[PDB]
Design a protein around this ligand. Sequence first.
Ligand code: CA
Ligand code: CA
Lengths: 335, 335
Amino acid sequence: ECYSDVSVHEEMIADQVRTEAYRLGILKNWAALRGKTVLDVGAGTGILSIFCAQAGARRVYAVEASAIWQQAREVVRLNGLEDRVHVLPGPVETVELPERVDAIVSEWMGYGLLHESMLSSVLHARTKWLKEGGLLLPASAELFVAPISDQMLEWRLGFWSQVKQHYGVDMSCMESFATRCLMGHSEIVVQDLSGEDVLARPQRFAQLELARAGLEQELEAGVGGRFRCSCYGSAPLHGFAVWFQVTFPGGDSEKPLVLSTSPLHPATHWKQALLYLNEPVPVEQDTDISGEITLLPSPDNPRRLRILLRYKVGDHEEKTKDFAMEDGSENLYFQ
Amino acid sequence: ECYSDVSVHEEMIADQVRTEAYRLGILKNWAALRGKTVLDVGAGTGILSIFCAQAGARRVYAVEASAIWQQAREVVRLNGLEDRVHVLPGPVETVELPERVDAIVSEWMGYGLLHESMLSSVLHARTKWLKEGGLLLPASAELFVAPISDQMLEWRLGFWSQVKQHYGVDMSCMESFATRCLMGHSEIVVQDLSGEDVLARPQRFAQLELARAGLEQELEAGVGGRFRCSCYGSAPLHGFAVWFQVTFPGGDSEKPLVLSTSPLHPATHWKQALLYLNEPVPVEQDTDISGEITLLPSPDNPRRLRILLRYKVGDHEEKTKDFAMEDGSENLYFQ
Ligand SMILES: [Ca+2]
Ligand SMILES: [Ca+2]
């Protein structure tokens, strides 16, 4: 039977930004991996564990709790690596490896970075299995926020005011209703934007070094920060977009590899996480926007992402909106 | 609160094939509508009831059971037709009109024509409210089936055999798994195709004249027919596509207007209904394919579409596959 959704896995590998960033980021670290052992947390179809072997790792432990672990084992064997790469079913928290490892690799990032991510699992595996001084791939993550005028949203809202010119029936009254429906909710919306949509310079509001003491406690407390920016020009402000990048150490190239999900960079399967205001706000060149954004666990469920937004536009009063990912949203690691 | 999904309604009106076919089909029938009364079954946002008034109807009763009926009333008033077009909430089976009507107009077609359609409601309204000899817009529907080699599916299945050439990891073992996942189910798949995908001449297998005696009983019994065709050339056969057209009488133009959902015609929001075999079947030029297809009500739920397929490819034995629309599929009239 088909428990995993094959279409999620093909979208992962069809994401050439993601796949080549990992391939090259792993290869950059040849000197550290050469003849060493690796734990791949959440190995999926196995492609990253095989990249590690191809980068010269001696042994790779590919741990995967989903149904797809079976396919990973077949992929490993098909590439003649069954000797070197061992696929282990189940959560990393209770697997037993025969040895501690020199490195951990993982595709752990969720939508919004921290929705249904495997970061907690990576941190647990680091604590339990990673040797002193060991390597983490990627090693860090950064979080960004920017105000947006979503041109696609603008088009959908204004579309009702356009019906008269195409069919001779005025439907501009439908715009209020469309606004309430499309913006008057507190759901985090996963959608891809372009640079067209970015309304002011993006602001880094958090940085996470995976090896650093205290990170798991920070995750429970909330990952966030204040921000301030000035709008590029006149537009309807629709809200904010959140995205991330992760960085692979450069190894002997001394050039880190950055995998970005910015709308100013090539699209990826993570898209961006959109936080819409209840309705559009007109802004102008040099309109000031400040606030604070915090990524939080939900109370019911720590891997359900909550985002608490405080914002102030120009002279308006500061407002707050508390967002969360919907129950029925798209899945990556927990299908 | 937002009970209706505004995005379904914008997709309807953004379907320029659908919207202009109704606009023009209604206008073709000016002589029959001039000064007459109309019942619009499932009026939605109201655009079709307003088209009817613009085509010269004296009075239009716009009946709509969904939440959107409120917006339809505002649209009517905004166009200054509140005198002539009356919006009536609730199902047509229990509305009371002050008079029988000269015509019925309705956008009743569902996915696959008969998934979650309003045809039954249109037939009930005809019986109860349409005058002797009255007009139905559209007046008839035709059902088509064709064998397909879905190039998009072909690409997704073969993608795993392509990974080696892009990333140097052989993942061709994933193709079997992908096939079982994407084809080894009995779900009707709503997806848009192009003529590229059509593997033999399409075959009309049913025709429904809405005014004809016995239609509602035929719906309960199953709407279907046998078919036979010869493949255009060498391809993997993935299954069959079902689509429909409806026809508006021509009025004094003597040229009926056909609204088609064929993949050889401009795309529409109805797309096509795809019936995949459990795995691909190679065929060649002049490979014979015959069988029978029946659109049926589901036992649990008469507006849940079931499709019973019998087929024989070339010299292979005749096979059967019993499909139905998934609980979690997309909605049009019943949101
Ligand atoms: Ca989920
Ligand atoms: Ca449904």
